[PDB]
Homo-oligomer: 126 residues x 4
Amino acid sequence: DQAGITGTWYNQLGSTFIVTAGADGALTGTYESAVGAGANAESRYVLTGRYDSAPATDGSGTALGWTVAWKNNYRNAHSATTWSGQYVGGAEARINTQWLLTSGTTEANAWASTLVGHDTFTKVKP
Amino acid sequence: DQAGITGTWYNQLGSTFIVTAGADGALTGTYESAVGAGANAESRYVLTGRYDSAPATDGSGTALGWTVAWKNNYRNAHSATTWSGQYVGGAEARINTQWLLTSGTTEANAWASTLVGHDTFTKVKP
Amino acid sequence: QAGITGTWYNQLGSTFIVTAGADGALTGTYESAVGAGAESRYVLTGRYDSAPATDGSGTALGWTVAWKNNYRNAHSATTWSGQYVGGAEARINTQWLLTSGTTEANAWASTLVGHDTFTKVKP
Amino acid sequence: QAGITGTWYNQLGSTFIVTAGADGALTGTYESAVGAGAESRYVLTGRYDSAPATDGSGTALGWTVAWKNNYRNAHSATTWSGQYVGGAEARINTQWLLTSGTTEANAWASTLVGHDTFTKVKP
């Protein structure tokens, strides 16, 4: 699935996920959020993650995850999102994810530090 | 916080989180889970993530996240966990996280693909 | 309340039959299309915001099912938290937590998380 | 049921007053120590497994609060999903989803997630 995961993906918000899958299980690329703090290189951030480079052959998806820390040369949202999900190959390839967005907070506000949601990615430029 | 995040951390399950924080916001290291599939290099896995390299100075934590794909040279659990959280410095430094563990599944079992939980890390070998 | 009350189906074909009370109560039954196994129906109770914002905001709500009835017991409970969005096709968009009773040693793995979207359109 | 019924406090100093019914109902009131703002108390309803495993497993349960009372409205709802663990110090360990009513454009950011542990020990 190295070839299948590698490429340019869009989620239902119109965010752009540009990723390279390495033979070793590495995910490297850039994430551009259509939404969030400060809503173009201004909106583009480094991501890293991992994927299962030897998935099951029973038609199971390929487990994968990645992180973005919302700091770049222009902007710092003092937060980080992780996406945890699976790649499903085939004619209309998709990545289905759930995510956790954690903000840096004081101890007093730590209860409210984390948003949760779900993003589905496809290769169709929306 | 590069120096503060860098090191060997243990969570409440006795898992071992060995991480290097890079000046650029990179997290690199190894994760050894005390629990899970197959429960020592057998139990040790590659992680990568990101952290906010320029946090707020208002006593806020430092947002960070990382991914493990549960494949190594010995074992493949066809799953991936992401931890999303914040580093809190001081005399008893801690990383507070929530996590998403996604398994590769068939489309029919995808509803049950993802576990959620919370891990707190400190530098105290338990 | 008129909007929320009724028969809803999610993307799995599960059936959510709810009555919204005037003062914020949700009551009814949930039949899951998936998971462990009248005998497939479970009691639900919940709460909703009976006075939502009037700025086109959704209506916040949530409910619980414990997966025990007189025939089956999955020793687990699901809570759905989400919002009702009125319109052409009314929708309830939810995230959910499914916690199983576990030993302390297995409690790290006690809780599944997902997301369900409900519409009144029969599968 | 005897174990679950009573006054619980979480790590934030929030107060959870619950009655466990014989047939799986949770009813009561929740006062949050944190967040938007009798006037600080909110209705809760939920469900619990009234016939848990006897293998030292916890008891699965869940409940909802919609953050509306006669004095305040935060246009939001929290659901807690978790398990009751009996013993020397009984504990309810939970994860929670807090969904706010939003516009469709802000619905990506509608839902906070966290974890609360409750004991009967007064803060």
